Amino acid sequence: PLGGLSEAADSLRELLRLPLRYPRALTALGLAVPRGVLLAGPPGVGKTQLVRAVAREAGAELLAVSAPALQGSRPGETEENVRRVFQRARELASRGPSLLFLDEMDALCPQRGSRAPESRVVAQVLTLLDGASGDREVVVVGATNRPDALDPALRRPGRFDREVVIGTPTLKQRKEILQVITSKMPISSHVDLGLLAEMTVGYVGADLTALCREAAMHALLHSEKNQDNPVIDEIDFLEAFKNIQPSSFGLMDIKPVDWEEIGGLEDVKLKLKQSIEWPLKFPWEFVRMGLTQPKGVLLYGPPGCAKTTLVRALATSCHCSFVSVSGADLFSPFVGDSEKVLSQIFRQARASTPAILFLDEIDSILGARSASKTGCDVQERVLSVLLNELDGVGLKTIEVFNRSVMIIAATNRPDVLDTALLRPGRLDKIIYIPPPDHKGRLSILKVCTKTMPIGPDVSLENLAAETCFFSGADLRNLCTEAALLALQENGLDATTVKQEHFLKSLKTVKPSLSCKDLALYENLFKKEG
Amino acid sequence: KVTYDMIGGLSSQLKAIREIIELPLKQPELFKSYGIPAPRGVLLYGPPGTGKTMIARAVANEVGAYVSVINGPEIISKFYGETEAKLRQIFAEATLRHPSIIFIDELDALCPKREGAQNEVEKRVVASLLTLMDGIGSEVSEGQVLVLGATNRPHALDAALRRPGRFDKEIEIGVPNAQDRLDILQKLLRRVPHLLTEAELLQLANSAHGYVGADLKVLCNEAGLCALRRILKKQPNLPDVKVAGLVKITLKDFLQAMNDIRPSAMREIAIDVPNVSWSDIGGLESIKLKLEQAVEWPLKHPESFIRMGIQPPKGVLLYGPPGCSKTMIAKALANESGLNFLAIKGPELMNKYVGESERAVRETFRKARAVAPSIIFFDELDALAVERGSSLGAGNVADRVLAQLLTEMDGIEQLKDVTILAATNRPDRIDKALMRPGRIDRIIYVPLPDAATRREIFKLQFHSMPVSNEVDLDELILQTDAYSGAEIVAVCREAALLALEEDIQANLIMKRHFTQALSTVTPRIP
Amino acid sequence: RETFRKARAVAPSIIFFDELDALAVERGSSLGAGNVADRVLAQLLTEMDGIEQLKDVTILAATNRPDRIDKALMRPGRIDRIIYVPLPDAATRREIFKLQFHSMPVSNEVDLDELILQTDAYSGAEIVAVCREAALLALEEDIQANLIMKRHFTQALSTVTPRIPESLRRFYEDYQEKSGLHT
């Protein structure tokens, strides 16, 4: 089955179905449906299997010809082979759904600066498709890995433009596909498939297949008695996973967090509530109230407050679709792709049109402008494409369809970023996040400690009095280490914890949150406005 | 003419590939019994000369079925078709020879990446190779036709090959080890008249650091030629009729032929269980205890202490003043608990190798995972973990290599039974971004040694240095406080130097020696 | 360049400028950045030169700190007529309030007088933000209330501070007094 693929499966179902699931004379009513799509991603996971399955679900000829099996030694035979296949597709259009499936177009497309015959090949298949446009039921699915690998000249409108990625290896789909694979394999009954799954970060389905493969392989190897029924044990499974190569590689944090895992600065909490989530009720609120929605807000606090936690809690308290934007997710070794993934995630926001998009630590996402004057050009290119795309606007004038994503950013070095970002019209609100006061310290200690083994001797208020210049993470690591001391030292197998260990751990973690740095931070990024 | 025994050591992967190759051919019914595809493309990888070709020929002997060695660049002829159609003929014969196996040498030449392959003939012939491979799936062909392979560099390969049904079994074979060094020595010298002894061979192998199979062949052959040279230099009127048998190799041959050898040991990955121990430097029991806790417990105790499962952290940074025998302690724990130690020192990383630095990082991490019960390590990582921004000519690489390092480590779960140890002596130097918890959390401070550690180390020295009993240890103890282990052993070295410098044939380090030593030394504790 | 070309092509038209001081940070400060700046300013002069060619093709600009410009634009002939935009008087403030109330359902406890009183040293758009935030405060009173209460307005007035000191107006009027032509 289409394990871990049914969502992309059905999206592509409707998309490619639109010309096929419904007749043509309506197109003849003055409409030209796009024809020819792209499936980009690591294959073997089911891409082939899924295109099979969907041509089935609609009812269509699974003409699963492998275009890599058409290479020619002399220019001209290749074009005749393509004539053969595309003509059979044409007679298929003469009969019904010509669901031509041609894989690995990029190997048939070495991009510019390459030799000549690629030109003949691509132009000739272009003739084929542009002519068969006249025919009634001509559709092709180029199956590759990355769209960038294909011919640029094959990405025009009225050409291969409807492109979709293979399924990103999600947890849910991971479990689905493990079960689907083993649905024909005699794995052991007791299987904590979720454990192995969460071990298999970044591992696409096919990787998981292969992993199970070698697992059962060594199972059969180091066992000989039950030659037919293997209890393919989770131990051999684990060891195989260990042996296996790591994965080759917009990850939304599935982890939900509420307003309880966070205390202090409830003023800023209510502010975020003001300028972000009330917009949900907006379609009638500003009506009886006037004021519009501020496009962009920028929350700034000292590095160490883990603002990301607050952002994720916000994303939790709204149910709105959420995607994250991080530099580590961004800094891939492909120059010119950062802008691309930016556009991609914004397009996804448009897709799940109610969308909240987070721009973390943008000083990392966008470094300095003119500090290193030799390698900071593509960064300004991302700057330009950002300043362009950040213009999400609508009718919004005196029922309403609230099709308007929202963008929120946060960082620690705003004095580094490009000043035009803060443009009234792009980022029309900025909020401050001071490190907690005595009360905030007390509260965040209380809430971070509500699961550690507490003893009847501690007095959090004293730490609060003395744990000044402490970040959230500071206090969290502090109570952590102190618990460790208490437990190990006294109770090798313990029950309680004493405050003495916190007192001792104080110096162990040197709090370098100098109040002068606080004043510097504040003055800088309050004049940043 | 080369049985498997003749192959220098590495018996483990030998047996592995042995079964993995024979049994498919024997009974595909065993694979099909557990619903298993017959693995088609095996591939070995490692630095050159290591035995790639040796393994090839030796299995070509042991098979009992067809083998068709195909050397890589030999097929490279720019005449189109010839390469692919020649492959076609190979595979047709492969069909007719149903129980068989095909190997390709220097396969990296055939599959350079599109960024490396500045010829597109490469890309199309790669395509044809893929076609072939998938075409082998003919049911009559199943269980009979099989694929081999080996490279100079698995990195120089192409992604299109390790895809399913094409290449899965990526076996690693690289630098041999101590027992393997001795093994390959014995295997080479199997049929040579030699003037060598057991312990001589032991210490010789001990002197070997980076050598490789064919390289050691060169070595022993050159030692034999040096012995022949010595023989014919004693008397020069000796034809080979009176010299071809008497000549045998002593150590001197080995040394002479050795000092002119660079055994490809410039940048490798040593799985080198060291010789250090707790006993080598004791004391600071609480520190080693907390450390072995943080490294070992998260598999046993927080398992039995998931009860209050606050968090078992992974990244440790347990550091104080410099010179306090830190890295010594690192190696100590590493060998005592029984893990395969690795190392990447910050300074030794201070290279302009764009990406190649991060490349070494990734490869090291992968080797670690391959030897999963183990401990990765860093020494003075602040060398490339410098305070960000201050070095615009050397830190611009530092930020990105650190980000790559992240990209790897960030498998907190890939970090299951795998820990990390960076190193420095200035906590302010460290960047709290790399301390946003999740990756590197727990921290210890290793303070200055104490009187207990002082008398410990002094006992060690007097156990390792002939000293005069009149110099009571407690005098030092009364004057050696606020010192460091490194400084203290330097003190002992200097006292020995004085003892030998006054009398060049003395045998007892007297009081005046230690006195003037103190005069020459100081607690450099700025 | 293409700007001026199109301007000519659509001759009955008006070029506009704003925040001139941005490009008008004087050279030498940034060694590698002000270069394009001075090139641009030079080419700007080179374009405007066609004043005859600018056959009744007027140029309007405005900025905040007019000093920061080069007098190459304030040299006589090209940009000579100058006007300081006076801060809004009471009537202007009341008009701003009218244009604000004409888009939000407000209560009847309004009183334009003391509003205009406690809105001096502010700018119009800032006062728009003030009434906007007061509407936000009423929304905080109830997610489905109707009319904003002027007590919450006074609360907002307390919250909002005039980040513009009268010293700025002093400097404005001083420059006005100590500059070239006004009419």
Numbering used by the authors:
A (entry chain P): 201 to 449, 454 to 602, 616 to 746
B (entry chain M): 349 to 874
C (entry chain L): 710 to 892
Quote the original article.
We show that SPATA5 and SPATA5L1 associate in a DNA-binding heterohexameric complex together with heterodimeric alpha-helical proteins C1orf109 and CINP. This chromatin-associated complex, which we name 55LCC, uses ATPase activity to process replisome substrates in S-phase, facilitating their proteolytic turnover from chromatin to ensure DNA replication and mitotic fidelity. SPATA5 and SPATA5L1 belong to the CDC48 family of type II AAA+ ATPases, which contain two ATPase domains separated by an intervening sequence and an N-terminal region that typically is used to specify protein-protein interactions. We propose that 55LCC acts as an unfoldase, thereby remodeling protein complexes and facilitating their subsequent cleavage by cysteine proteases and removal from chromatin.
To understand the assembly of 55LCC, we performed single particle cryo-EM analyses of the in vitro reconstituted complex. We noticed severe particle preferential orientation, which we improved by using fluorinated octyl maltoside for grid preparation and that allowed us to achieve an overall resolution of 4.5 Å. Subsequent image processing and focused masking of the top and bottom portions of the map improved the quality of these regions and allowed generation of a final composite map with local resolutions of 4.02 Å and 4.52 Å respectively. We could rigid-body fit two copies of C1orf109-CINP facing each other in a diamond-shaped arrangement sitting on the top of the 55LCC composite map, with both CINP molecules directed towards the ATPase pore. We next focused our attention on six unassigned densities located in the top region of the 55LCC map, four adopting a vertical orientation surrounding the C1orf109-CINP dimers and two positioned horizontally underneath C1orf109 alpha 1 (α1), α2 and α3 helices. The overall map resolution in these regions was sufficient to discriminate between the SPATA5 and SPATA5L1 N-terminal domains (NTDs) and permitted positioning of four SPATA5 NTD models in the densities surrounding the C1orf109-CINP protomers and of two SPATA5L1 NTDs underneath each C1orf109 molecule. Guided by partially visible linker loops connecting the SPATA5-SPATA5L1 NTDs to their corresponding ATPase units, we fitted four and two copies of the SPATA5 and SPATA5L1 ATPase domains in the bottom part of the cryo-EM density. The structural model suggests a 4:2:2:2 stoichiometry for the SPATA5, SPATA5L1, C1orf109 and CINP subunits, forming a full 55LCC complex with an architecture not previously observed for other heterohexameric ATPases. Mapping of the cross-link sites in our cryo-EM model indicated that C1orf109-CINP association with the SPATA5-SPATA5L1 heterohexamer predominantly occurs via the N-terminal and ATPase 1 domains of SPATA5, and it is further stabilized by secondary structural elements in SPATA5, SPATA5L1 and C1orf109 as well as via direct contacts between SPATA5 K196 and SPATA5L1 S88.
